[PDB]
Amino acid sequence: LPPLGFAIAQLLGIYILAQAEDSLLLIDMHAAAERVNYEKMKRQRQENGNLQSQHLLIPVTFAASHEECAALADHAETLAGFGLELSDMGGNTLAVRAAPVMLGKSDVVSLARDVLGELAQVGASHENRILATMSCHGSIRAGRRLTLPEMNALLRDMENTPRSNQCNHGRPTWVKLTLKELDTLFLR
Amino acid sequence: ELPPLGFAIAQLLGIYILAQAEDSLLLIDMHAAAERVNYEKMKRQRQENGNLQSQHLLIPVTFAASHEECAALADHAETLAGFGLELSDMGGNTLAVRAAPVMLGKSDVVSLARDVLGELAQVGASHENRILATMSCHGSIRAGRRLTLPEMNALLRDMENTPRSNQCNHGRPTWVKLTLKELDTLF
């Protein structure tokens, strides 16, 4: 059955343990979820030009810096490019109107901030950097408590992800220990 | 807080219990840990009490036996009670198990009776360890039996409560610990 096997448990919040044919896999879940996210976004930005938003049911308002308000004013277009709709409603309060479908909300503010934060820097092809930053913000990350099928869904996505096994920063996203090597841990 | 072997989170490849202790993963060699635990419980009961405390089955378990097993029963009924086992002949080479050691999880009491009877065929008290060794393979944790997370924890608590739980016969560790830092090092 599948190369990344089946989820068996989650560890000190950081790891997914899975059982593959004759092996244990330890998947760095955050680093893995990021990679999937990044690629799925890099693809969409390539195939539909923009990322698709979702018109928030309850517009989440938040206290912004001037710097952030300025970024919104200068890059309204670009933010729609990344499936983010925001409006500036005085006294440094911003409102999130719409967030990307493919990040299933969660601290929408924290996402908004980060992108504003990235756009602030531009003073184009800042794309990869921005998506990498956006890649950290999906359903799985920082918080934990996944179900086994949630974990399975991830390993499935990973199997369809054209640089699984690599975080935004070079490291592997999983380790495999074969039956042979496991046995070797118990060496006399 | 947490006990040293932590809590079971899964079973792996039929062979290992995975546990989470503080800041670490443990892998336990389930069979080796169980054998070791069982041996020590028993050998200690034998030196403390002279004999293993047996427990009666509500419905005796019958099985077809070889002539050699029957002759073994006839010769060593007393020795067998010393090992917490009681059987009845019954005739036509059928034996019944009436009682099996407390320290075991049944386990096919038939399998156990057969192994111990077999071990008794080859003697005519210096066999102690040999016998307890064989018996130790027959608790509730053994071969392709899938455990619940509470059963897995009960073995871990047992280990913590057993001397020499850390090594098997060969002097092989029974468990291995990987800390958060070590885990990250493998990346």
Q: How far is CA B174 from CA A51, A188, B37, B134, in A?
A: 52, 10, 10, 18
Neighboring chain A residues of B20 at a CB cutoff of 8 Å: 11-12
How many Cβ contacts (< 8 angstroms) between chains A and B? 52
From CA A10, how far away is CA B122, in angstroms rounded? 50
Does residue B76 contact residue B120 with C-beta atoms inside 8 Å? Answer: yes
From CA A1, how far away is CA A156, in angstroms rounded? 12
From CA A129, how far away is CA B56, in angstroms rounded? 71
Does residue A26 contact residue A180 with C-beta atoms inside 8 Å? Answer: no
3-class DSSP state for residue B93?
coil
Write b or e for each residue in A5-29: b if 16 or more Cβ atoms lie within 10 A of its Cβ, otherwise e: bebbbbbeebbbbbbbeebbbbbbb
Q: Do B183 and A9 touch (CB under 8 A)?
A: no
Which residues share a beta bridge with B99?
B56, B86
Neighboring chain A residues of B27 at a CB cutoff of 8 Å: 182, 185
Neighboring chain A residues of B25 at a CB cutoff of 8 Å: 11-12
Q: How was this structure determined?
A: X-ray
Q: From A22, which residue of chain B is nearest by alpha-carbon distance?
A: B13
Interface test with B, best of A178, A183, A185, A187 (most B CBs within 10 A): A185
Q: Do B187 and A171 touch (CB under 8 A)?
A: yes
Residue A33: what residue type?
Answer: A
From CA A100, how far away is CA A89, in angstroms rounded? 21
From CA B88, how far away is CA B97, in angstroms rounded? 7
The residue with tokens 């059955």 is A1
Task: Note the maximum CA span of chain A.
Answer: 70
Spatial strand order of the sheet with B54-64 comes to B54-64, B94-101, B86-88
From CA B107, how far away is CA B101, in angstroms rounded? 11
Which residue blocks in chain B are alpha helix, DSSP H?
30-49, 67-82, 109-120, 128-135, 149-160, 180-185
Question: Looking at the complex, does the CB of residue A12 fall below 8 Å from at least one CB of chain B?
Answer: yes
Does residue A20 contact residue A169 with C-beta atoms inside 8 Å? Answer: no
Pairing, β B94-101 against β B86-88: antiparallel
Question: Looking at the complex, does the CB of residue A172 fall below 8 Å from at least one CB of chain B?
Answer: yes
Q: Do A186 and B29 touch (CB under 8 A)?
A: yes
Does residue A83 contact residue A98 with C-beta atoms inside 8 Å? Answer: yes
Question: Looking at the complex, does the CB of residue B146 fall below 8 Å from at least one CB of chain A?
Answer: no
Chain A segment 21-50 residues within 8 A of B by beta carbon are 22-24, 26, 28
Question: Looking at the complex, does the CB of residue A20 fall below 8 Å from at least one CB of chain B?
Answer: no
Judging by beta carbons within 10 Å of its beta carbon (0-12, 13-18, 19+), is residue B175 exposed, middle or buried?
buried
Spatial strand order of the sheet with A23-28 comes to A6-10, A15-20, A23-28, A174-178
Q: Do A24 and B12 touch (CB under 8 A)?
A: yes
Q: How far is CA A176 from CA A18, A183, B58, B65, in A?
A: 9, 13, 48, 47
In 3D space, the residue among B181, B182, B165 whose CA is nearest the CA of residue B3 turns out to be: B165
Angle at B67 between CA B65 and CA B72, to 5 degrees: 90
- Domains of chain B listed by start with CATH number: 1-51+143-187 (3.30.1540.20), 52-142 (3.30.1370.100)
Neighboring chain A residues of B24 at a CB cutoff of 8 Å: 12
Phi, psi angles (nearest 5°) of residue B50? 80, -25
Pairing, β A23-28 against β A174-178: antiparallel
Neighboring chain A residues of B33 at a CB cutoff of 8 Å: none
Neighboring chain B residues of A186 at a CB cutoff of 8 Å: 29, 172-173, 176
Min Cα distance B171 → chain A (Å) is 6
Question: Looking at the complex, does the CB of residue B63 fall below 8 Å from at least one CB of chain A?
Answer: no
Question: Looking at the complex, does the CB of residue A117 fall below 8 Å from at least one CB of chain B?
Answer: no
Q: What is the resolution of this structure in A?
A: 2.4
Does residue B162 contact residue B139 with C-beta atoms inside 8 Å? Answer: no
A110 DSSP 8-state letter: H
Q: Do B20 and A26 touch (CB under 8 A)?
A: no
Q: Give A100's contacts (C-beta < 8 A, 6+ positions apart).
A: A41, A51, A52, A53, A54, A82, A83, A84, A134
Q: Give A9's contacts (C-beta < 8 A, 6+ positions apart).
A: A16, A17, B9, B10, B18
3-class DSSP state for residue B125?
coil
Q: In the numeric block, which tokens belong to residue A117?
A: 């934060």
From CA B179, how far away is CA B173, in angstroms rounded? 17
**H or E stretch at A109:** helix A108-120
Min Cα distance B24 → chain A (Å) is 7
